[PDB]
Amino acid sequence: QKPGETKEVHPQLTTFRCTKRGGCKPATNFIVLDSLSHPIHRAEGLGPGGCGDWGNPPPKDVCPDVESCAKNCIMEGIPDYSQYGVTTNGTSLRLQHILPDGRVPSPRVYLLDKTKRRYEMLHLTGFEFTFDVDATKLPCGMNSALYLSEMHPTGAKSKYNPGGAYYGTGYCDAQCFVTPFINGLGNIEGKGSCCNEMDIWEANSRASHVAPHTCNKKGLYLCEGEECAFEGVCDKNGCGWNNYRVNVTDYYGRGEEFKVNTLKPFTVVTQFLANRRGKLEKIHRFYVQDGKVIESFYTNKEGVPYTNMIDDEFCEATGSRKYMELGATQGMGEALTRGMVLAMSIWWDQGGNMEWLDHGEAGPCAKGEGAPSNIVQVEPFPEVTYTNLRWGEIGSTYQELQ
Ligand SMILES: *[C@@H]1O[C@H](CO)[C@@H](O)[C@H](O)[C@H]1NC(C)=O
Ligand SMILES: *[C@@H]1O[C@H](CO)[C@@H](O)[C@H](O)[C@H]1NC(C)=O
């Protein structure tokens, strides 16, 4: 959609680049809300209304074709990101799901480079990504997410999408959802927006999940029909890694009973380990809390290979069929090598209560406990803070107390 007159005021976020010899060096980045979370209205003279709802093509009165949609639908800048639950402070990013005014902005943001006009493209195969988190205000059913999508670096800036990454255009993920704009262009045919997705972190104070999701496509693919469905071009489920799913129940949770005690802040380290041919072979997650490294658990379950890292043998054995068919760990790594955009979000699930994250096989949350209607009794204002985003050489992003 066409940018409007209102100023976009991106929050500034200091991050780090790390090497063993040089330590962690600060860098300037900016934060941008998803394009379709900006106010979208019709051009002057065309009356009231927007330009479409999630899940659908844009309305054909203003968007009969891409060219018309591009002139007839206007996307306003956001001058105060706090109105959407997004604030920064130094090296910290705070995402508020619910505001005191009662709004539920459920923000999703991307990391922009220092120019504000191109996403910060991360190339993580053979490297590590680390962040600090405060998960205390995330009960059952909440998902704080920090993940990578194979979005285009400029948000696919083009004649009809002049806003680009500066306005957060170009979102895609492994769910192939239909949005009224894709790559900043009106989605006349109602295609889904598909791409490879590495879910570094999907977690609350009750469970922590990691999952690569492959697609058989490079970059953003517009899917039709069955291509967007479970048997299509992307892996909806992912290859999931959650201590509870592998019968380790004392690793992560609220209290001293857990190794990673989510009542306190902690550091989350993710290494993307390559083989000698430079292809991704293993994904390794460990933590740091109270100045001490917390190594990964090993799996502890019948039928699950004994491992402390995600790899093809584990993914296959645990039933990650589309993951394997659509490229497996090597395919995920090829996307990481090409370059990915960092997305951070907070959300809840009216339909399914986030049960896959923290209920049953996946955690301690009871049936119904993660419903949004229950979340608000437990934590009226869910929120997450990510701090000290940093990436670089294996072994360089963390430091134990001496
Ligand atoms: C920012 O974060 C710091 C450290 O948690 C805190 O003490 C201060 O009160 C917060 N706000 C600023 C810097 O606006
Ligand atoms: C969990 O692990 C214990 C061994 O530590 C084993 O005895 C038990 O059967 C396992 N339970 C499940 C549900 O897999």
Author numbering: 1 to 402
Give the authors' words.
Though often considered synonymous with cellulases, β-1,4-glucanases are enzymes which recognize β-1,4-linked glucan chains which are characteristic of both the cellulosic and hemicellulosic (i.e. mixed-linkage glucans, xyloglucans, and glucomannans) fractions of plant biomass. The catalytic actions of a variety of retaining β-1,4-glucanases contribute to the breakdown of lignocellulosic polysaccharides. Humicola insolens Cel7B (HiCel7B) was chosen as a model β-d-glucanase since it is well-characterized, has good hydrolytic performance with chromogenic substrates, can be readily crystallised, and has been studied in our lab previously. As a tool for the rapid detection and identification of β-1,4-glucanases, a series of glycosylated cyclophellitol inhibitors mimicking β-1,4-glucan oligosaccharides have been synthesised.
The addition of another β-1,4-linked glucose residue to the non-reducing terminus to give 5 improved the performance of the inhibitor roughly 7-fold (ESI†), however intact MS with 2.2 μM enzyme and 5 μM inhibitor revealed minimal labelling (ESI†). Treatment with 5 gave small peaks with mass differences of both ∼338 Da (equivalent to addition of 1) and ∼500 Da (expected). Soaking HiCel7B crystals with 0.1 mM 5 also gave an unliganded enzyme structure. Repeating the intact MS experiment with a higher inhibitor concentration (50 μM) resulted in more overall labelling, but still a dominant mass difference of ∼338 Da. Lowering the inhibitor (5 μM) and enzyme concentrations (0.5 μM) gave overall weaker signal, showing incomplete labelling, with a mass difference attributable to 5 as the dominant modification (ESI†). We interpret these results as indicative of an internal hydrolysis of 5 to give primarily a mixture of cellobiose and cyclophellitol, which is unreactive, and secondarily a mixture of 1 and glucose, which gives rise to the smaller observed mass difference. The observed concentration-dependence suggests that both hydrolytic processes have a higher KM than the KI of the interaction between HiCel7B and 5. Thus, the course of inhibition of HiCel7B with 5 is enzyme- and inhibitor concentration-dependent, being affected by the KM of the two possible hydrolytic pathways and the KI values for 5 and 1.
